[PDB]
Design a binder for this molecule. Structure first.
Ligand code: ZN
Ligand code: ZN
Ligand code: ZN
Lengths: 148, 144, 155
């Protein structure tokens, strides 16, 4: 089978008092992510992993973040690929993300037209290390498997 | 042909057990085994290590990895391979790589040739480069 | 079939008086990457992903830290060893993270170099360029990082 893998990375600064939107979920918090778009680091990492798996370049080259993810999926399908699964990790010292993971997974699954059982989102802190551990930013990592 | 991929990340502060090998980190804080565990739960879409094994009292990370592998199996997946990287400025890890690989392979019931561990320094950059923490990354491929 | 995945990571310091070589491309810049070889962080990450997928260890095992080695030659040798182990490469994806210089103008040349070295068509190789949004040592321009993923199949 013509399987392909992709990987994505994104990070943004946390600044006052933008909305904190991750995986399409607005999370109550005193700061939010800084970017030209809504700065949804998780959706950006996933988008990059998908463009990467399909050898379609990157988010910079191509481009709210859910609309961008739906367009990415469209472009991946246009190239003849089907998405098999996505896995991801968010690294944030605060706030607590566990209560929001299920809604993120639902949003992603809806945007990629996947069943829930093919989408995973994990949450981590950075153990108080570095800019992530000081709460200066939030990072996301993603992996995607597609097939032509 | 129902393959799935997963990825994992862990870091801990240095105040030493890595890949089950006593060679320290502040669980037993085994960053490599935690990253692998997260990659496996991610491939099976089972969530994450913090949900499955919440702060198991007294359980070491090899035990947690074996329990993860059991849950992945009960979900209907077989593990095909794992790859990983440890980033530590010190000590030297190369002499311990085979022992780590053998521990992981034993816990996952995989042949040695399906398990890989790599080691890197951070070229003196950041908290990793100053010896303040150790990071691990992992990737896993599974099939239903 | 017998698919395997691998992942790679590399970072090098940026310093005056070195060539900046990324993905085999010599990029004009007043600083370059420091290492034993030409310090091509992108090629090194990809090399690590390939050795990882094949369960062949890591770049340090194979090419011990080569003074000024051409990392394209190292990548070609890595690919030869992966093939001798019985694996065929299916795809490579990667990311480069740098505050400066601008890398987007060079991405296509990097992809072409990687594809030629791995005997792959261009549509199986991807390179993505990022900044680190002003955060950390990467945002201060102290070094450049690369990440890679590879899929192989044991023939
Ligand atoms: Zn972003
Ligand atoms: Zn851990
Ligand atoms: Zn290197």
């Amino acid at each position: 089978m013509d399987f392909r893998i992709g990987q994505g990375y994104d990070v943004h600064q946390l600044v006052p008092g933008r909305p904190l939107i991750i995986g399409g979920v607005t999370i109550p918090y005193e700061r939010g992510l800084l970017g030209h778009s809504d700065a949804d680091v998780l959706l950006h990492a996933i988008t990059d992993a998908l463009f990467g798996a399909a050898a379609l370049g990157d988010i910079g080259r191509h481009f709210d973040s859910r609309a961008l993810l739906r367009e990415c999926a469209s472009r991946v399908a246009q190239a003849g690929f089907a998405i098999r699964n996505v896995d991801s990790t968010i690294i944030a010292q605060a706030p607590k993300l566990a209560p929001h993971i299920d809604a993120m997974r639902a949003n992603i699954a809806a945007d990629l037209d996947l069943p829930l059982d093919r989408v995973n989102v994990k949450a981590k802190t950075n153990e108080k290390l570095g800019y992530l551990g000081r709460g200066e930013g939030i990072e996301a990592q993603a992996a995607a498997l597609v097939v032509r």
